[PDB]
Amino acid sequence: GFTAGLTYSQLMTLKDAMLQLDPNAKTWMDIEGRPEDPVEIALYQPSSGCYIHFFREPTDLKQFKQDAKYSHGIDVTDLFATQPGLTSAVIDALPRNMVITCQGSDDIRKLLESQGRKDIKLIDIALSKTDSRKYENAVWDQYKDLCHMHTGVVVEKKKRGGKEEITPHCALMDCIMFDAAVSGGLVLRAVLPRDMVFRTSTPRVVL
Numbered sequence: 166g167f168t169a170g171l172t173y174s175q176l177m178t179l180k181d182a183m184l185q186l187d188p189n190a191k192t193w194m195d196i197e198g199r200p201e202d203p204v205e206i207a208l209y210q211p212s213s214g215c216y217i218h219f220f221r222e223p224t225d226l227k228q229f230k231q232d233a234k235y236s237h238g239i240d241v242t243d244l245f246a247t248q249p250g251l252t253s254a255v256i257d258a259l260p261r262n263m264v265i266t267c268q269g270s271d272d273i274r275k276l277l278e279s280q281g282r283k284d285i286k287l288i289d290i291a292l293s294k295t296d297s298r299k300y301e302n303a304v305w306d307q308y309k310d311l312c313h314m315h316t317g318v319v320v321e322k323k324k325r326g327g328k329e330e331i332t333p334h335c336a337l338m339d340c341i342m343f344d345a346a347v348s349g350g351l352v353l354r355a356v357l358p359r360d361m362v363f364r365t366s367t368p369r370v371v372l
């Protein structure tokens with residue numbers, strides 16, 4: 166038995182980082198991509214400002230391209246360097262019986278259950294679409310430097326008329342804006358090291 170993808174030292178570094186979480190603080194979680202094949206993951210604790218944020222290369226390119234066009238605007242080339250096994254290792258390290266808050270619990274439930282974490286309790290805050298996006302503009306304005314990965318034009322599917330571009334959906338900004346909507350208004354600290362979420366790329370001769 167073992168944790169796939171990460172070597173032991175990486176794993177102990179992650180384990181130590183994860184202990185920066187307050188196990189009882191309100192904790193948001195949000196993902197981009199389907200729960201069976203997620204490409205962006207974020208957890209957020211407003212009280213401390215602690216956030217977990219990382220990415221994953223998709224298994225299904227076809228579905229990913231649809232999601233990029235209509236939801237997240239992420240370019241797969243920026244995902245080539247992601248750390249294999251990171252999603253499983255992070256979720257394994259979440260405190261037992263932790264209470265996690267989300268907007269729509271269905272996808273979060275599926276993802277956690279696929280990791281054998283049925284012990285985690287979910288609160289679906291169930292915001293209207295409109296209510297959930299009240300602080301969208303404000304959040305991107307203040308925190309855009311925390312995520313540069315949404316590079317593609319994202320559009321609304323329309324039956325008629327002109328093209329309509331929309332603001333891309335980011336797991337991290339989602340957490341922040343759903344929390345602002347709940348708290349009636351709007352620093353932050355990264356839990357994970359940058360060299361853990363992305364493997365440093367280096368030159369090679371193709372063999």
Ligand SMILES: [Zn+2]
Pocket residue numbers: 205312313314315334335336337338
């Ligand atoms: Zn993002």
